[PDB]
Amino acid sequence: VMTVRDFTQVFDSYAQFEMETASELGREEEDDVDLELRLARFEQLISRRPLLLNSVLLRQNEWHKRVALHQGRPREIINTYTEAVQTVDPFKATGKPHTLWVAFAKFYEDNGQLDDARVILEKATKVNFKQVDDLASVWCQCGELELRHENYDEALRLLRKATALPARRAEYFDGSEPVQNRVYKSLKVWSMLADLEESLGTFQSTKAVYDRILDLRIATPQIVINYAMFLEEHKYFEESFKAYERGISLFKWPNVSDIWSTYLTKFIARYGGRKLERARDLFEQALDGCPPKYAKTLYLLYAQLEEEWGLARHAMAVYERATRAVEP
Amino acid sequence: EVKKFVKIGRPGYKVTKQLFQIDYPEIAEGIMPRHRFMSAYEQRIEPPDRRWQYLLMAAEPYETIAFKVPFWTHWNRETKQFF
Amino acid sequence: PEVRNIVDKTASFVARNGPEFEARIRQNEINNPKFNFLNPNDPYHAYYRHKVSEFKEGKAQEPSSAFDLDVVKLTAQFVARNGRQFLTQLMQKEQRNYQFDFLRPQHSLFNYFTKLVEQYTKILIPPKGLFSKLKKEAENPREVLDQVCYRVEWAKFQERERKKEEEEKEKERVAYAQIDWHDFVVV
């Protein structure tokens, strides 16, 4: 056939008497050519079931993988899942092939919970230099599957093994993205490994250093999680200084250094001795720069702490010194 | 100077023969297109079998409408169409 | 298409107000990657800065002898009185058993016949000698001075027209004499 509606003629004949070329025309010209004509011919031969018009006609004019897989979802084309898990169109993609290995692992879950789940996981794990978080996110999705299977011990096996194995290559090889982008990724990777702090325990006292070398560049988002973990596993002066410098030395405009000053003062009190020289001295050394981050957040520590010191004289010296720096 | 400031931008000739018509961008200049049909003997290669000739109407802002050849014209400027 | 709509949106805002508003908005929202497409930080950098050019220039779409002279005088007398395009006093003279040698338009004498007809019309306009005659000519050297100056002004405009036409033709001839002579090619 060389024209259209020849499809419908063949359909009428086969129907009164009741074809991948119709699919080749279901994936036809790009922008609004038919997207429905060969679809209607194959889907109204008489009518039996398209079962592929949806997938092919939605891959004609990413998420075309879902556009396919939702056609015959649970088990109707249960054998055609082989084709339906495919989104290849061989090209460069970001989140798409890692998402695709994750989706074939979910298909494996529905198919037997192991039949190609870790197969697809390892397949995507044997990819090019990391340099990007799509691969780390697919491997950590596989690790989330590990922690999901409720197997605590072997889930920690998978977490440790293939979440400290990215610690050999988390990011920074090549690309038009020049920022390494390993810090937050491998922070979430350590989160999935241990010290998730909301689900699992069994993190050692060295878990704080694990989180530190799990950032390995900086932890600006996770100064909070690092502070919590450090004052849980240690609850000491190293933890206090860790949280302080975690907010202070990571990023300016103190969305971190305000909470860092709070951590420094409150920890130097409730771990390192109360009302002492260390609290107020570290407080001054932390909030020296301390612009009006919110309104004025560099006196609300030292003035009140010099008043808690108990001495009217030092409290008054610090009160004049802070009121001469109240509202600049 | 006509050739020393001759920017060769490489736009195309989008014309139909069959009476030769082209579409072209507006250079904003009083120069109208100049055409001529000549012999195919001048080029930086000169492949043999040079008896077929170049009928070309060239202008400033467009790649000129040239072709084999085997006033009586004009260019509508507010509409940007050469006939 | 979130990143697509972001690149196209920054493209419309930069097709309207430009990379200066890019620097402004990036300094205002460079804490969050919602402006990372207008900054070096997102993958929509190239697509964005080019789509601004596209939607600005008009490539992108909104995001979604005495005897012969006497005979000519008689031809003018007939063309002054010919009152219909197909009815006149000369339709009979053409095929009415005589010679009609000024009746040709392909004869060059047709042009002198047209001039004689213009003269008969210059006599047949009511202001030309039918029933009204104005004396601003018979006793008017001031209107005559006005008319001399009017001819002179037409002459000045015409001299300018001739000079501009000569210049335009010379420039166009030089342009054809410098037109593309090497890259002859067809599409």
Report CA A257 to chain centroid distance, whole Å. 24
**A62 touches A96 (CB < 8 A):** yes
Q: Do C175 and B2 touch (CB under 8 A)?
A: yes
Judging by DSSP bridges, how do beta strands B75-76 and B54-58 pair with one another?
A: unpaired
Alpha-carbon gap: B51 to the closest alpha carbon of chain C (Å): 14
The Cα–Cα gap between B2 and A163 comes to 68
Kindly tell me the burial class for residue B45, based on how many C-beta atoms sit within 10 Å of its own C-beta (0-12, 13-18, 19 or more).
exposed
Kindly tell me the burial class for residue A289, based on how many C-beta atoms sit within 10 Å of its own C-beta (0-12, 13-18, 19 or more).
exposed
Report CA B34 to chain centroid distance, whole Å. 7
The Cα–Cα gap between A280 and B13 comes to 79
The Cα–Cα gap between C7 and C1 comes to 10
Nearest CA in chain B to C171: B31
The Cα–Cα gap between A23 and A2 comes to 15
The reported resolution of this PDB entry, expressed in Å, is 3.0
The Cα–Cα gap between A141 and A154 comes to 16
**A4 touches A33 (CB < 8 A):** no
**A105 touches A111 (CB < 8 A):** no
Nearest to C13 by CA among B13, A317, C23: C23
Residue B82 three-state SS:
strand
Q: How far is CA B21 from CA B16, B18, B56, B77, in A?
A: 5, 8, 12, 14
Q: Do B66 and C179 touch (CB under 8 A)?
A: no
Report residue A253 as tokens: 């405009």
- H helices of chain C, in order, are 2-16, 19-29, 45-57, 66-81, 91-94, 109-124, 142-177
The Cα–Cα gap between C36 and C43 comes to 8
Q: Do C180 and B58 touch (CB under 8 A)?
A: yes
The Cα–Cα gap between C185 and A9 comes to 46
**B24 touches B59 (CB < 8 A):** yes
Residues after which chain B is discontinuous, using a C–N cutoff of 2.5 Å:
18, 70
Helix (H) or strand (E) holding B63: none
Report CA C141 to chain centroid distance, whole Å. 38
Alpha-carbon gap: C22 to the closest alpha carbon of chain A (Å): 20
Report CA C179 to chain centroid distance, whole Å. 25
Report residue A313 as tokens: 């004289």
Residues 12-31 of C with CB under 8 A from A: 31
Q: How far is CA A41 from CA A84, C5, C35, C89, in A?
A: 22, 35, 47, 76
The Cα–Cα gap between A248 and A256 comes to 6
Which DSSP category does B44 fall into? S
Residue A310 three-state SS:
coil
- H helices of A199-276, in order, are 207-215, 223-233, 237-248, 257-270
Which DSSP category does B55 fall into? E
Report residue A203 as tokens: 């993190």
Residue B65 three-state SS:
strand
Residues of C in contact with B13 (CB under 8 A): 187
**A317 touches A299 (CB < 8 A):** no
Report residue A42 as tokens: 């194959």
- H helices of chain A, in order, are 6-16, 21-24, 37-43, 53-59, 64-69, 81-84, 96-112, 117-125, 133-148, 152-164, 183-193, 207-215, 223-233, 237-248, 257-270, 277-286, 299-308, 312-323
Nearest to B77 by CA among B24, B15, B35, B36: B24
Alpha-carbon gap: C159 to the closest alpha carbon of chain A (Å): 59
The sheet with strand B54-58 has its strands ordered as: B34-38, B54-58, B65-68
**A276 touches A314 (CB < 8 A):** no
**C54 touches C12 (CB < 8 A):** no
**A216 touches A182 (CB < 8 A):** yes
Q: How far is CA A2 from CA A6, A20, A21, in A?
A: 8, 15, 12
User: Is residue A62 within 8 angstroms of chain C, CB to CB?
Assistant: no
Nearest to A87 by CA among A103, A73, A76, A72: A103
Residues of A in contact with C41 (CB under 8 A): 179
Residue A157 makes CB contacts below 8 A (sequence gap 6+) with: A146
The Cα–Cα gap between A280 and A303 comes to 9
**A134 touches A116 (CB < 8 A):** no
Q: B65: which strand partners?
A: B57
User: Is residue C43 within 8 angstroms of chain A, CB to CB?
Assistant: yes
Radius of gyration, CA atoms only, chain B: 14
Residues of A in contact with C31 (CB under 8 A): 253
Residue B66 three-state SS:
strand
Report residue A217 as tokens: 């560049």
**A30 touches A89 (CB < 8 A):** no
Q: B20: which strand partners?
A: B17
The Cα–Cα gap between C40 and C52 comes to 15
Residues after which chain A is discontinuous, using a C–N cutoff of 2.5 Å:
18, 61
Touch between C and A (at least 3 CB pairs under 8 Å): yes
Amino acid at B70: P
CA triple A118-A125-A226, angle to 5 deg = 100
Q: Do B34 and C180 touch (CB under 8 A)?
A: no
Residues of C in contact with A253 (CB under 8 A): 31
The Cα–Cα gap between A98 and A126 comes to 12
The Cα–Cα gap between B62 and B75 comes to 12
Residue A137 three-state SS:
helix
**A255 touches A220 (CB < 8 A):** no
Which DSSP category does A307 fall into? H
Helix (H) or strand (E) holding A250: none
Alpha-carbon gap: C183 to the closest alpha carbon of chain B (Å): 7
**A228 touches A205 (CB < 8 A):** no
Report residue C115 as tokens: 């001039």
Residues of C in contact with A179 (CB under 8 A): 41
Report residue A50 as tokens: 């398209």
The Cα–Cα gap between A160 and A162 comes to 6
Nearest CA in chain B to C174: B2
Report residue C42 as tokens: 């997102």
Judging by DSSP bridges, how do beta strands B81-82 and B34-38 pair with one another?
A: unpaired
Residue C123 makes CB contacts below 8 A (sequence gap 6+) with: C80, C129
**What is the number of alpha carbons within 13 Å of residue C72 lying toward its C-beta?**
18
Residues of C in contact with B36 (CB under 8 A): 176, 179
Nearest CA in chain C to B55: C184
Alpha-carbon gap: B79 to the closest alpha carbon of chain C (Å): 16
